[PDB]
Every structure is written in structure tokens, then in C-alpha cells.
Amino acid sequence: TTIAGVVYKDGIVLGADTRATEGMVVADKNCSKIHFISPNIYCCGAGTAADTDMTTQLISSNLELHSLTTGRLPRVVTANRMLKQMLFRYQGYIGAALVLGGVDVTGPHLYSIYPHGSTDKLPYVTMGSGSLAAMAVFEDKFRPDMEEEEAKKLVSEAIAAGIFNDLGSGSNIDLCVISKSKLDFLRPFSVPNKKGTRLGRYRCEKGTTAVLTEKVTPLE
Amino acid sequence: MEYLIGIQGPDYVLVASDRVAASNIVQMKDDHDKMFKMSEKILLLCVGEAGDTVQFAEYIQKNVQLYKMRNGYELSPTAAANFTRRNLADCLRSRTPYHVNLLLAGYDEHEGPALYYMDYLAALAKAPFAAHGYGAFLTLSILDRYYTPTISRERAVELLRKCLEELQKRFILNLPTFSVRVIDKDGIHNLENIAF
Amino acid sequence: MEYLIGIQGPDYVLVASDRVAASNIVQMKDDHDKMFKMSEKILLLCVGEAGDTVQFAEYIQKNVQLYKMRNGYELSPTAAANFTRRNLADCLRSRTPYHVNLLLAGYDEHEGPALYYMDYLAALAKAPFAAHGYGAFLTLSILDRYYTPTISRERAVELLRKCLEELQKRFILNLPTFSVRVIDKDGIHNLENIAF
Amino acid sequence: SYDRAITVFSPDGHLFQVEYAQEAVKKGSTAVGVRGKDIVVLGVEKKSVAKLQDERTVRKICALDDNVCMAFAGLTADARIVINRARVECQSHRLTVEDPVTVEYITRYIASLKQRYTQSNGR
Amino acid sequence: SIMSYNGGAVMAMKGKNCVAIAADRRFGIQAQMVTTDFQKIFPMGDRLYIGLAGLATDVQTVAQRLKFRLNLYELKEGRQIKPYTLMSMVANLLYEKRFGPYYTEPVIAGLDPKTFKPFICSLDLIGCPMVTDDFVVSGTCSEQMYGMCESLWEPNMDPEHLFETISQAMLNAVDRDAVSGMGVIVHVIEKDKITTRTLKARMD
Amino acid sequence: TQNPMVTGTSVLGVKFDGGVVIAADMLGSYGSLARFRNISRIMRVNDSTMLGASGDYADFQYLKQVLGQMVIDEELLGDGHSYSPRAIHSWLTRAMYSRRSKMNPLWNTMVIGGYADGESFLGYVDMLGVAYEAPSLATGYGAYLAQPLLREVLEKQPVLSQTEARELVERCMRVLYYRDARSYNRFQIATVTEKGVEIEGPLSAQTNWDIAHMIS
Amino acid sequence: TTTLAFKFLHGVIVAADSRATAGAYIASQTVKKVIEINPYLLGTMAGGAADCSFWERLLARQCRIYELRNKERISVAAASKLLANMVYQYKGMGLSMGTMICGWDKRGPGLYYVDSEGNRISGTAFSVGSGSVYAYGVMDRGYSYDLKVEEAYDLARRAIYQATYRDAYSGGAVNLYHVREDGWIRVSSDNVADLHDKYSS
Amino acid sequence: TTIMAVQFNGGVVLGADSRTTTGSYIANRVTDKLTPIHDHIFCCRSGSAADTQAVADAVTYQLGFHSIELNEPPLVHTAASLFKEMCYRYREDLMAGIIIAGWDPQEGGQVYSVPMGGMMVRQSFAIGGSGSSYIYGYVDATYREGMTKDECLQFTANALALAMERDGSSGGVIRLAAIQESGVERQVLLGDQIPKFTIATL
Amino acid sequence: TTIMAVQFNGGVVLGADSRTTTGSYIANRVTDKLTPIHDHIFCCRSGSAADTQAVADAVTYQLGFHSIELNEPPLVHTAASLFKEMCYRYREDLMAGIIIAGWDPQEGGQVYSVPMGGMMVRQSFAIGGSGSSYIYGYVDATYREGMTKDECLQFTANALALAMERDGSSGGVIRLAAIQESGVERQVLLGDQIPKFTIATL
Amino acid sequence: RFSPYAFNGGTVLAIAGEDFSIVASDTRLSEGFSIHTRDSPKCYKLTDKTVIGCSGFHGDCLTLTKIIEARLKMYKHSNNKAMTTGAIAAMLSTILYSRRFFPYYVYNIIGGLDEEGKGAVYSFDPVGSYQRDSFKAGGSASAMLQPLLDNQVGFKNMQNVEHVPLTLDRAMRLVKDVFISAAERDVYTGDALRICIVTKEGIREETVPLRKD
């Protein structure tokens, strides 16, 4: 798992991979790791996959309940405090590593939330299995107040570094660009890896399997 | 250690169990009954822990009899097997679990003869023949060899005798007496004990 | 598990052992002999570990026979019991210790009948009657009750039969057959096997 | 340890130490054995016992096993070593092979024991 | 291993306008086989099936408690359940027991009512859903099932071609697993018919 | 060695057109304390080969005196034969595995850099005996941080110049100072060439801390 | 794993399966579990695959030297004792084996059970392995000393078959061997799946 | 992690490093360890990052409600007591070393030190964290009684630079904070701005 | 335990504390940790009392025999190498942290450090033991390049006094030793002769 | 404390034919979650009739190959003969068992030709147990390649198949297919596949790219 986030002049670019593994075997080739929180805040996920989904959905549910009562767009600090106070209460038993990022009326705000409950406010953060490879790209090529397309190139290179070097990460690169007026959710941004198509067909011929009993039930 | 065996026929269920209640290295009881009368046509073969056997088997026994009095009619062998599974499965992740491997035998008025295998973890499985204990490892192979779906009750006891003689020959634990009971359309019938 | 028993009279030594070689839950052998011929009037009965029993018993057996050839005369039952004790005590604190509980029985030309008890730690003790195993816990009390120092071998086999019948009733492990041998003035005699 | 070569070859092509050992056996008491149909019998001559000596100790006929016995000639001090070494082998054979030792096997062991002492250092 | 105690394997596959689900029939404790005829695939609504693999107790317990929540859903709402709706129902059921989960990995296979679209997914013991367009596998021989499905599966397959693919992907993967076997049952789900076959497999 | 005491962190290595460059920071960490900030972890074996080591420093000094003497002993003969970069690497694989099998291993991770017969060599040796050849190498936390940066440049441009290889290392050493807690801003740059092995003195990478203000 | 051997009037029957497992995963279903020691002696494989193969091959080496020195064949009792003595020196170290040595001796048909623990016992019928408990059941019910040659084949072949049906670690193919006075002969190598169709009809 | 707070006449001077490590990897090389609780009250965080941040936010909530209810500027002793009551009650669950330093119009500049045990004591100077163990000799020798504001800024900056030099867990950047009657003023000493001390070379 | 050795133009200046503890109880408050090996060579012992004393006596035997064979005044590098060979070979058995400092006619003043691992390195100044951790900040800030004999005596005394103040395992008496071409001169700092440092109180 | 073993991944495959023998393996060498190198072939040729493949702990794999290479010369000098595939397979069994109580974390597969000319494949475990078979997969992705080999090469579970003999063209395609599938699921398998072909003529090598992630 390689998830990353960056802060540029207009807004925030978030990045994630698509490999989900059971032990040391790839279970899902295409998996969504950028999660919906609000129409202005998105959150990347790492660690325990089931813990990431249920914690995200609960905060997204609470903020929709919050925004409708207030009648205005929710803040990133509200999303941060909700995730901060819950994960601390369970003392790190909910293994959810979340990279939070969105655009408010105050501006762009980026957060890195650990399963234990610790939060860090930084221009660029990396978490997951291939976070070491992704941070090295940022620590070499990051510059303050950069362009949108330049920031998209920065994150895509960081996720790719975690993809090829780390065994836990692989397949496609997902990007999420959030600005003051525009929200671009590019699901398949870059596909660096693909299956070498099978030249030898192993299609089983009709009637190669021995059948003992057969029963057909009609439907409406 | 305790032992169970059940053989199902076309219109009957044959069940047998050892009469040995053992502690450490000594045989305390010579005529121990491990069969519990659930209904007029249902028997329960309970085997496992020291205290969990009597406590669990009787709890289900009285609850089945409670159903009989409240409604007038008795539970079916299928419904009784699912009831005893539910109580064991719910207690599995609780503070006090029952470590008991049981075998349910019953005759239904509509569906006929039935035999149910159940693990201590509460896993119900319908089988024509089943066995519990270390003696099951020596007897199930004989039950795989000579068993037929259309076996007569006089041949079933003869098949049962072949398995019990294997326990006298190979099995390291001394099990002299066995309780034999048959369940059919008339109910539960007590049969002569096979002793060595 | 294995079992031993020895009853010593005024002019004879009666010894018996089970014929069960058991593994995990199965009886591999039915006619296993746990009695070793040391001399013309000495027997050794070894019980314990899987490999230590055969290896230790034969080592002392061939060394006693070596004494016979090198001198012309056999070892006395007392000297043989002390020789086998020395080999186990020296190996006790070594790299490879033998975990064997043995029972030595012999007849002397000068002293007469003799029976020796021995632990796996190598502790020799002369006793009129002794037993090994879990079955010893059930038989020693009977041997404390009906035993007399001037018991005849007509009554000793009957006393032996009283102890083996207790194993059929209370002992949890199945021991159907027992090998019986008598050592006296004329040597070692094979008696009829007591079977159940 | 003593590592001097005792038995060595000679100009003519003879092992003197072996030949002198063959002179020691010739000087010893006579021993004859014959093979019959059902029984094999060996006997020793020139006992030359002073009659004032116990004839139970000076017996040259020694049984190696229950079915094997031997009679010797020459140095009686050397034979007593070989007899005892052969007697151990009879019991050592039984520990490895449950079958009793045959006449041909025990003779091959004694011969190889004598052969190794004609080639080893210091012996 | 807790999952390897009872064994078992469940497979689901996508076709053109049809979904197939296959599972082994062995019920056994550790090494000893007990029952040849054990149910692991359970009907959920005429055109939707769930296959459970793992601990034999949790396989039966989840199926019963899911049917408990299924019938109440179909009585409160005047409609048959959707495959996406059932997926979330299983995910909710398993996550309720987060710090003491049912040791079973559910696999849902079936067609979407009214919209005739195929659907397959597999879940974790704590309830983590993932959707695929090819195949989903769960059990003790997960690695064995992956190797067969990655080589045999094709994009668009008819009911008869899909049956031959899922059958061979199971049989060969099961034969390399000690704790799984004793017959393989396949349910081929179409818009018009459900075809149930019990395949000739090795009984060792 | 069962327990490592004074240890050295990441050692980098990358081969360019006609030579290899290896860099290692001058630090001997005692658990978490920076005990010695002026120690050399890079050694010159001979005219065509050099060595840089990670892990326990006391074990490195032992390998320093052995390899030091082995070159002296060879230079005594003067028969026109010298140890190749592969020969030192092969010996070191046998040296580390032999002590691993004795359950008393040298707590070290080496990066071998050499240039002989117009061929650039770069070798890796574990404390267990695992050895291989790679165009770019990084040990410890360098394999997680610096190696990803080294791999992407060599993917785009396989052959580098001496200037391009040096600036890549200085970029990697900067990132190591940012993220590795047991690193120091004082490193030596060692280079193999046709002229020989040359190790430069104390060098420091320029660091930027502009992210200090942009939080609010 | 299921290996069985029994002796009767005509000789000694040796029967074994062929399933080898590395945990839950099956590594091979074609392993030769009946180890061919000599043209007159046979062994079995149970527990450790390499432990049974190496030491019995060392025995096969030792038996050949015995034949060259003594001009006679080694007895079954001596062949069982040699293997028992060698493995005993490594007791409680990590070796795991459960072999049965079969052969025709001067005394008659021979059968010995040798363990890595140090067991050495002679009997009429034995079964070693994880599925040995199921093999004893069907074998003892149809056993006879005056059993026919063809009747002896059907007993052992089915005894493995019934064991493979219940035991998860047993399967593959049933290998059968008959031991005669002149030497052993390879009887049949029937597959479990092929036998399943045979016993059904 | 190295945290420092020195008391002078008009108020207090606080200083902290910026390195937070999870093993041997630095998760954040520019962490702000000086958390504001009120207008003139600050605290220094050391130990578990999840624990220190959760308690600091709780005290801000507790003192915030306390200040409005009493209708008076909060005391430094009051803010330190709220840290004391949480660090002592949950001492087996929390791993925190908080130094609370601020200013009130009643007493003035105050420095309170609350370690892992949960005790509270007022000090002239207070050092905490993993890197503080390396500067116990320096601070005791250099500290002069009656130092001015500008001298205390130099005193804290030098001690932190020496601690970050030797400790692996400490490093990054120096963050200073000065609190008085006028308000709170903060400055950050960068990479070249750090007080350089000569490295021992032959 | 706190040990120190500072190199100057003429030779070396040594310093060690006097406290040896077996848990929390002082077994000896008069321990002399400055062990003489030769005429101009000394070593500073830290760690296990049984281990350090046995090695120090073994090096004295080895170097003593070595110096006579060559018929030449022994080098400090030679003496430190004998400590190195014993500390590295038996690193899993011995608990020793030896600092060797002396004088020879070929090189002059030399200070070598042999830590727990068994490595050897020459330094301008060296500190070791349990109490040395607290004075890492002070020594790095106070040290000046090219200090005279008298300045090094005060530099060692001040650093040791601050270490014994904070460390529980360090305390008692400062023992100093100055070695040059003239020979070895030792002095003992008592109770009131100790370098005075103020305790900060409100 | 200290662990002398480390899992380095890698999967080795071998298929025996009527006159050919194929030994193939991935070039990926990794540890934990990081990749050491992308070019590290596990296939190594011993003679003109034998090729060995080693998987598991690379430290043991690198050493053991040097033992075999040393023993190949020792047999060559003493017997004046090139060591046959059957002899090497028997020799490796004794070398692996000599380290019984301190075993090599190694999964060897020997592929070559016998004295007659047929293809021979031998499978080895960490301790030294060996057997001859038509096909064998060993390593990290061994459980992924074997079920496909049982179906396509062994013709198992299929009802009415004519049983077509193995050709080099078909076997080479089957090797390339399974490693493509293995690279998708197994993380230890990828980068590049190297295939060694043993025939009457000699040894030939071929390299096919894989997933780099």
C-alpha cells in the first residue's frame, strides 16, 4: 500500500495504488483506496482494509449529518478531529492509517492520521507499506506553490516509486485533485503494469468434465 | 475414554455406547448410560467434558419436554438437532462454553429415520453412519466397507458387533459392555447388551 | 502402558508380565514377551521407554553371558542385580540416560529365591513382592493382603490370578494376555498363559 | 606412543617377526583335532604337568561360545588375550546380528586380529 | 490455523449473462473425514447465492443469521434483495463481531434482479468487500485456486463454457489440497434456469 | 557477534561510465547516541577495488586488517597477479557465510566497488552470506529511501558520467539526513577509476527547511 | 500416509499409498513408499521422507557387504537390528521414521516394525502412518492365515483404499508387493480414483 | 525529542526540537511541539504523539470553559493542575512528559514540569524528553540567576542545539517561544541559523 | 561511573570518579579507576569491576614483556591494541569500556577509546561510563582547540563534577592524572575542593 | 537473538520430455518487502546434460552450487568421466542430508537427460529426499503452477482427451504462460523469466520479461 498527498498553490493532490494483498498473495488488482468523505474532502487509506472502510464511512456519515444541520460546507479540521478522537479511544486496535486532504473556506489542509490517534499537519505526507519510497521522491523534487499539472506529476512519481520497489504495492496509480472550484477524480491516471496476454489458449472443450447428477430449476 | 456409534437403516436407527465412566487410571462405574431420552422417538448421545456432559444434555432435554407440554405435539428429529446446535453455538464465544461431542438419533413420522453428527464447536452434519472418540478411528473404516443403504436390523447389529470386536482387539482402552438401543416407528427399544 | 508383577516364595520365584506392545491408541502386538533370559536361573523384566528397553536389557544379557564363558560359572542373582544397577547409575548423569524400570528375578544355589525392585534412577531394593506400572497401584494392596512368607506355588498362581482379575475390572488399559514363568531349583519353567 | 616398525620385510623377501612367531608355536605343546560324522574332537599332548600343579588352570581347551571351542599351541600368555577378545566378539555378534556366531566367522576374526598385529606400529 | 481446521474451498466466476458458483463437499475435523454431503452454498433469493468457507460452525451460523436478516428485509421492503445490498449486509454482519469474528470468508455470486447484470465478490473474516469482473476465491487452497483461474478464465463466456471453466479450476486446485475434496458441486445461474451439477472427483 | 554495539548506517553505491562511486557517512551510533562523528567506514583494498560497510564498526575493523594484510601478502610476490573486484567479493561471501554457519556472524553489510579491465563492478554482501550484482546499491535505510531514487534515474539513463553519478549521490545523502534518525551530515565520497581509488575528505549536503513555516 | 504389511502361509504382503504433503498442500502423489532395499528385502516410508530413504539405503549398503563377506544372505532379524542400532544413536535429536522390514528368511516369512524412537518388534500384521488406524479396521476383519494368494491382494489393496477415503494425508495410488522365497515381486500400482469405480460396481 | 522552558522576570521562554521518530525512521522532521492552550499559556510535548496531543486538546477544553466561568485570565498553576489530574489518573495508560510554561497577571512567569509519574513541581528551568539526558551537565553549569529575556532565548537555543547534535531521536529545527504581558512571540531557527559547535577532529 | 581523558600539546590529562555500585548500594566510594600499565601509560575502567581489572592486569603483563623484547619505550597505540584484542575477541563475555591515554617519545600525547563493541579510535577527548551521558552537552560546548595543561586539568574536573551531580552511579572523589615527558603526577580532589555549581531554587 | 535463515523468494519450474528437459525460474531476488535485484537467475548449468535450479535462502543456494561445482571436478579427475544426471541427483541427496540437524533452506530441482536420452526431472526437499517425475514446481509460487501442470501435462480430471505427447514447442509455451499468471498473484515472482533448455545438442537460454511491480 502506497498513499500520498501534496499541497500546491490552488489545492491538494492525493495519490494511491490499487494492489490489495492477503498475506503475500495479491487478492485484488484494482482496488479503490481514495475514499469519499465530503464533496470537498477526500481521504486515502492504509493498514487494515476493513478498518479503513468502516471508519471512513462513519466519518462521512457524521459530516453529512453535520453539514445539513449547519447548512454549509464542512471543514478539514472537523474531519480530522472526528478521526483523531475515535482512533485514540480504541488505543490503536483499529489499524487505520489515513491521509486526509481537502479545500475549505480557510484554504487547503492536509493531515496524516495514525491508527493510535496521532495527527500531523504537513505540506506533504506518505503512509503505508511503500511510504519510504514515496517520501524520497517528495524530499527531492517538492517545491512550495507549484502548478496543478506539476503537482500531479510529483505524486504520480511518488506512488510509482512505491509500486516498483515495494512488494506490498502494485498495479495502477489513482489520483484525486481537489481545488477551490474544481474536483478531478482521476481513477485510472496511469497504468504502468499489465498482463502479458496469453498466446496459448487453455479453453476447456464442451464435455471434458464428467458429471454424476444434473438438475435444472426453471425461473420467472 | 468415551465412545459412540450410530447406524441408520431404511426405517430404523441403531445406536450404541460404552458403559465405562473412567477417572485417571481406574474404572469407577461398570454400567454407565450415555443415552438421554429427549422424546418418545429421540435419543441424545452426549460425550465430552466431566461436567459439561450432564449439564448440557439435560438442559436441552427439559426444553424439548417443555415444547411438548406447551403445544401438545413433540419436536421433529430435524428441529431438535438444530435446537441443540443453537445453544452450543451461542455458548461457544461466551464465558462458559460446553466441550461436548454429541450424536442425535431420531425417527420422524413423515421423513423417517435420521442421524446427526455434531462437533464440540457446534457443527451439525447429517450422516448415514457416524462415530465419536478414539475408537471411531478404528471403526469408521469397517462402517465404510460393509454398510449398505438397504441394511436389515439383524444385519445392522451384526455390523455393529464387527466394530465392537475391533475395540477388543486393537483399541488400548478397556470397554467391556455396550448399551444397544433401536429407534423405529414404535419408539425406543432396549436391546441386549453386547458384553465381552 | 506396560505392567509387571513378581511373587517370591520359600524356594521359588513367580514372575508375570503383559503381552501388549502399545502405540498411541492401537495394540500393535498380542504376544509380546517382556522377559529376558540372563542365565539358567535368572530372568530380567524391562519396562519403560521405546528404545531404552531392548538396548539396555540385551547389553546386560550379553555381558552376563560373557562372564559365563570367561570363567565357567554363572553370576549370582545378587551380583547380577548389582551389575545392572551400576550400568544405569553411571549412565544417569551422562549424555544418554536409559529410562527403564526393571525387575530382576533369580535363584541361587546357596541363598535361594530372590526378587529385586529397580527404578529408572537406578535404585536397587530387595523385596518379597513387587510390581511396576499403573497396574501396580491396583495390585500391591492385594499383594499386601493375601501374601504369606511361606506361600506355596499352588496358591501363588491363584494369588497372581486375583491380581490380574483386578486389571480386567478396574484398570482402564486393555491387557488380555499375561506370560507366566517360574524360577526354582531346576531353572526357568514356562507356565500356561493366563488369558481373558 | 610407541610407533616403531616391528615387523619389516627382508632382502630375501621374508617377514622375520612372523617367522619367529611360527617358531614359538612349534616349541609349544602339541594339539590335534579331527572331524567326525556327528562329533568334532580336539586334544592336547605334552602336558608335562609336575602333578603338584592344579590341572584346571592350565587347560588349553577353551570354549569361545556355546557351539564354538578352541585349542592352542605356543605362548599361553598370548593365546589368553586372543581367547578373551574372541569371546567378546561372540557376544558382540549377537548384539548386532540376532543369529549365533558360526565357525567360519569367528575364525576370520581371529585371523584378521593376528594379521593386523603383523602390520601395525609398535605391535 | 483456525481456517485449516475444517478445510473447504469456494469459487465464483463471471460469464456473459450468467454467474457460476462452485464449492467442495468435504466435512472433516483436521485429518479425519466425517461427511461426504455437506452444504456450503446457500440460496438467498432465486437468483443470488452465497458460498461460505472456513470453520464449519461459522459457515452454518452466518448463513442462518444472514437468512434471519434477509427475510426481514424482504418483508419490510416489497422487493427482492440486490447483490450490492446483500454484500453490504454480510459486511455489516461480520464487522459487528470485530474483536471476535466468525472464521469464515463469504463469497457472493448471482445475477442482479430486474437489470440482469452479473455480480461476484468475496469478503474477509471481519467483513471487507471487494468487487471483481473475473473471479473470487476463498478457502484453504486459495493459492491453488488463483493459479487455475488466472489461466483458464476468459472475458465473455456462455453458460456451457463457464461451467467447464469453473469445474476444471476447482477439481485441479482441490486435488492439490489435502483438507478439501470428496466431490464438487456447481451452481450455474441463468436468467431462465439454475443448473446444478455434482462433478466426478477424487475421493481421497 | 551476537549483539551489535557501535553501528554505522546506510552505505550507497552506483557505477558510472568507467568507474564506481561509493558514499558513507562518518558516524558510529551507540544505540541512539551519536558517539563518534569522525570515523571512516570506507576503505581502499587495492588499486582497483574498495569497500564500504554498514553495521557493527568493530567487526569492520577486523575485516579491515584481514583484507589489508591479504593485499600486502599478494604484493610481496610481485608475480603480475592481483585480486580482482570479483575475487574480493567472492572471498567476502565465503567469509561471512562461514561465520554465519558457526552461529557467530560478523554484524556487517558491505558494498564492493571496483573497476578492472574496462569493467565496472558493484557487489553486495549480507551478514548471512547473500550476494548479488546490481547497477545501484543501498544498505539499511538506504534501500528504502535512496535506492528508489537510484533506480528511476538508471531506468531513464542507464549510463552516467562521473559528475552525474556524484550529484545523484549528494541528492540521496540529503534525503537520508532528512528521514534516517541515525545519520549524520558528514560523509566521504570514494571513487574507483583507471588512476586508482580516491577518497575525498569531510563533505556536507546543503539542507532546506522551508517547510517549517507552512503549517498553518 | 498409510503403509501396511502382513505375513501369511504363502508369504508377506506389502501395501502403501503415495501421497506426500507439506502441511495442507499436497507436494506429490507419486512417491515410492515401498523402499526397495534388496532383491529379497523390502521397507516402507512413513513420517520423514528423507529419514526413511537415507538410513534404509545405508542398510542396503550394509547388507551387500555382509553378503560379500559371509557368502550368505542376511537374515530379516539381523537386517531389522542393524537399522534399529544406527538410528538409536540419534535418539531425541529430530529423526522421524516408521518402517516395516519384510523378507523371506531361513526361519520363514519375516516381518519387523522399526521406529526412530528405537522400537523393534516382530509380529503377523502391522500398519504405520497417519491413516494406519483405518487400515487396521478392514484388515483385521478379513484376515486369515490360510488365506489364498489372490484373496491376500484384495485385502491389502482395499485396506489402503479405505484409509485414503478417511485420512486427508493419504491418497494417490495403491502400491502392492508380494514377498516370496526366491524374492519379492511387484504386484500392482492401482490408482485410488480407478479403484473407486471398481468397488462401486 | 528535547523540550525546554526557562523562567525570567517578565515571563517565560520555551524551546523544542522538531523530530518525531517511529523506530529509526523520522515520520515528521518539522513537528510543532509547542502547543497553545490559552492566550499566554503554552505546553511542551514529549513521549507518545497520540497521547500528548489528546491530553493537550482536553486541557484546552477544560481551561477554556474554566476561564469563561470565572471571568478571569487563567493561572499557569491552574493549567498545570489539569495536566496533573490527567497524567496521574491514567499514568498506566499514557506515556507523556509535559512541561507547562506561561504567564498570568497574578504571579507572572511560571514553569511547571509534569513527568511520566504524574507529579507537579515549579522550577526555574525544566528539560524533558530523550535528548534532555545529554544536556544535564551543560544547563547546570551555564544557568545564571537573574537572566534577561534575550539571554534566556540564547540559553535555550544553545542547549537544544547540543542535544539535537548527540541524540538520534532529537533533531530537525529549533522552535522558540517568548511569553510576557505584551503577548506571545515565536521564532524558528533554521539550518544555517543553528548555533554551530566545533566537531572534535585530529 | 564517569571516566575522561583529554589530550594536550605535552601529553594527556586523565580523570575518573570514585563510585562503584552493586545495584543501589555503594561497595566502594574510594575506587581508583586510573590503572597504570607502564611508566607513562594509563587506562580508565568502566563497566564490570571483575572484567575490567582482569584485562588491565593482562595488558600490563603483555606490554611489559613486549617492551623488553624490543628494548624501546612502549607506544600508546601498542598498549591500546592489546586492550582492543581482548575486548573484541571476548566481546560477548566481558563488560568493559576502556579509555587508554598516555605518552610516548615517538608520537606524544594520545587518547584512545575502546567501547563495548571492541573497536579502537583516536580522539582529542574521550568520555565513558554511565555518568558520561549527562555531560555530552557540556564537553562539546566548552572544549577549545589547543588548551594548555592547566586548562585541561580544570576542564576535566568541571565535567566530572557535573556528571556526579546528576548520575546516581557516579559520585565521591575526582581523581586526576597528568602525564608528560617528566613523568606522571596525580592529585585528589576532596569534598570542598570539588568544583562548585549552584542549585536552582525559587 | 539471531536468525541464520532468510526467505528470498523465487520459483523454479521443470518439465521433462521425450528428448528434452526444461528448467525455468524468475530473476527476482527480494527480502521482506524490498527487492534486492531484478537480475538474479536461479537456473545454473552444471554439465552438458544437467541444469540445476535453486530456490529459498540465497545464502545457502550460492554456497551449495559451489560445493556441487567442486564435487563435479573431483568425480571428473578420479573416474575420468562426466557425471551423469542420475549420479548428480544421488550425490545432492547425500550433501543435503549431511546437514540434517542444520539444514539448507533450499528447494532444488535438477533437470537433464539420462543415459538413454529421455528427459529427466528430479525434485528435492531441504533435507535430501528425491524422486523422478515428469514435472515439478518448487518455490514461492509452487502452489500456483502445479495445478495447471496436473491438468495440461498430466491430463487429469479431463474425460475424453487423446493424450498428446509433449513437444518442445508446446512445453516452452506452457512455461511462459504459468509464469505470466504467477506474476499477477505472487509478489515474489516477476521482473524477468529465464528458461534453460537441455537437449541432445546442448544447453540454450532464453529470457522473457515479466511484471516489474
UniProtKB/Swiss-Prot annotation, chains B, C:
Tissue: Detected in liver (at protein level).
Cellular component annotations (GO), alphabetically ordered: cytosol; nucleoplasm; proteasome core complex; proteasome core complex, beta-subunit complex
N-acetylmethionine modified-residue sites: 1
Entry keyword set: Acetylation, Cytoplasm, Nucleus, Proteasome
Keyword Acetylation: yes
Location(s) in or outside the cell: Cytoplasm; Nucleus
Main location, first listed in the record: cytoplasm
InterPro entries: Ntn_hydrolases_N (IPR029055), Proteasome_beta2 (IPR035206), Proteasome_bsu_CS (IPR016050), Proteasome_sua/b (IPR001353), Proteasome_suB-type (IPR023333)
PROSITE patterns membership: PROTEASOME_BETA_1, PROTEASOME_BETA_2
GO biological process entries: proteasomal protein catabolic process
Function: Non-catalytic component of the 20S core proteasome complex involved in the proteolytic degradation of most intracellular proteins. This complex plays numerous essential roles within the cell by associating with different regulatory particles. Associated with two 19S regulatory particles, forms the 26S proteasome and thus participates in the ATP-dependent degradation of ubiquitinated proteins.
Assembly behavior: The 26S proteasome consists of a 20S proteasome core and two 19S regulatory subunits. The 20S proteasome core is a barrel-shaped complex made of 28 subunits that are arranged in four stacked rings. The two outer rings are each formed by seven alpha subunits, and the two inner rings are formed by seven beta subunits. The proteolytic activity is exerted by three beta-subunits PSMB5, PSMB6 and PSMB7.
Organism per entry: Mus musculus (Mouse)
UniProtKB/Swiss-Prot annotation, chain F:
GO CC terms: ciliary basal body; cytosol; mitochondrion; nucleoplasm; proteasome core complex; proteasome core complex, beta-subunit complex
Coarse class of the protein's main subcellular location: cytoplasm
GO molecular function, one term: lipopolysaccharide binding
Tissue: Detected in liver (at protein level).
GO BP, sorted A to Z: negative regulation of inflammatory response to antigenic stimulus; proteasome-mediated ubiquitin-dependent protein catabolic process
Record bears the keyword Cell wall biogenesis/degradation: no
Keywords, alphabetical: Acetylation, Cytoplasm, Nucleus, Phosphoprotein, Proteasome
Induction comment: Up-regulated in liver tumor tissues (at protein level).
Cellular localization per UniProt: Cytoplasm; Nucleus
Top-rank taxon, per record: Eukaryota
Modified residues (Phosphotyrosine): 57
KW Phosphoprotein (keyword) present: yes
Annotated function: Non-catalytic component of the 20S core proteasome complex involved in the proteolytic degradation of most intracellular proteins. This complex plays numerous essential roles within the cell by associating with different regulatory particles. Associated with two 19S regulatory particles, forms the 26S proteasome and thus participates in the ATP-dependent degradation of ubiquitinated proteins.
Similarity comment: Belongs to the peptidase T1B family.
Name under which the protein is recorded: Proteasome subunit beta type-4
Biological source species: Mus musculus (Mouse)
Coverage span on the entire protein: 46 to 261 of 264
From Swiss-Prot, chain G:
Keywords per UniProt: Cytoplasm, Hydrolase, Nucleus, Protease, Proteasome, Threonine protease, Zymogen
Quaternary structure and partners: The 26S proteasome consists of a 20S proteasome core and two 19S regulatory subunits. The 20S proteasome core is a barrel-shaped complex made of 28 subunits that are arranged in four stacked rings. The two outer rings are each formed by seven alpha subunits, and the two inner rings are formed by seven beta subunits. The proteolytic activity is exerted by three beta-subunits PSMB5, PSMB6 and PSMB7. Directly interacts with POMP. Interacts with ABCB1 and TAP1.
Conditions for induction: Up-regulated in embryonic fibroblasts and neuroblastoma cells by antioxidants through the Nrf2-ARE pathway (at protein level). Up-regulated by the antioxidant dithiolethione (D3T) in liver, small intestine and brain (at protein level). Down-regulated under lithium treatment.
Keyword Nucleotide-binding: no
Active site, per annotation: 1 (nucleophile)
Catalytic activity: Cleavage of peptide bonds with very broad specificity
Transmembrane segments: none
Top class in the EC scheme: hydrolase
Summary of the tissues where the protein is detected: Expressed in uterus at the embryo implantation site.
Disulfide bonds: none
Shown stretch of the complete protein: 60 to 260 of 264
Primary site of residence: cytoplasm
GO terms of molecular function: peptidase activity; threonine-type endopeptidase activity
Family stated for the protein in its record: Belongs to the peptidase T1B family.
A cellular-component GO term for this protein: centrosome
Entry's Gene Ontology BP terms: proteasome-mediated ubiquitin-dependent protein catabolic process; proteolysis; response to oxidative stress
Its EC number(s): 3.4.25.1
Localisation per UniProt entry: Cytoplasm; Nucleus
Binding-site residues, bortezomib: 49
Name of the coding gene: Psmb5
Curated annotation (Swiss-Prot), chains H, I:
EC number(s) recorded for this UniProt protein: 3.4.25.1
Record-annotated active site: 1 (nucleophile)
GO cellular component assignments: cytosol; mitochondrion; nucleoplasm; proteasome core complex; proteasome core complex, beta-subunit complex
Catalytic activity: Cleavage of peptide bonds with very broad specificity
Transmembrane parts of this sequence: none
UniProt-recorded Gene Ontology molecular function terms: threonine-type endopeptidase activity
Highest taxon in the source lineage: Eukaryota
Keyword Phosphoprotein: yes
Compartments reported by the entry: Cytoplasm; Nucleus
Induction context: Up-regulated by the antioxidant dithiolethione (D3T) in liver, lung and small intestine (at protein level).
Residues recorded as bearing Phosphothreonine in the entry: 35
GO biological process, one term: proteolysis involved in protein catabolic process
UniProt keyword list: Acetylation, Cytoplasm, Hydrolase, Nucleus, Phosphoprotein, Protease, Proteasome, Threonine protease, Zymogen
Protein family (similarity comment): Belongs to the peptidase T1B family.
Function: Component of the 20S core proteasome complex involved in the proteolytic degradation of most intracellular proteins. This complex plays numerous essential roles within the cell by associating with different regulatory particles. Associated with two 19S regulatory particles, forms the 26S proteasome and thus participates in the ATP-dependent degradation of ubiquitinated proteins.
Protein name: Proteasome subunit beta type-6
Gene that encodes the chain: Psmb6
Included range, full protein: 34 to 235 of 238
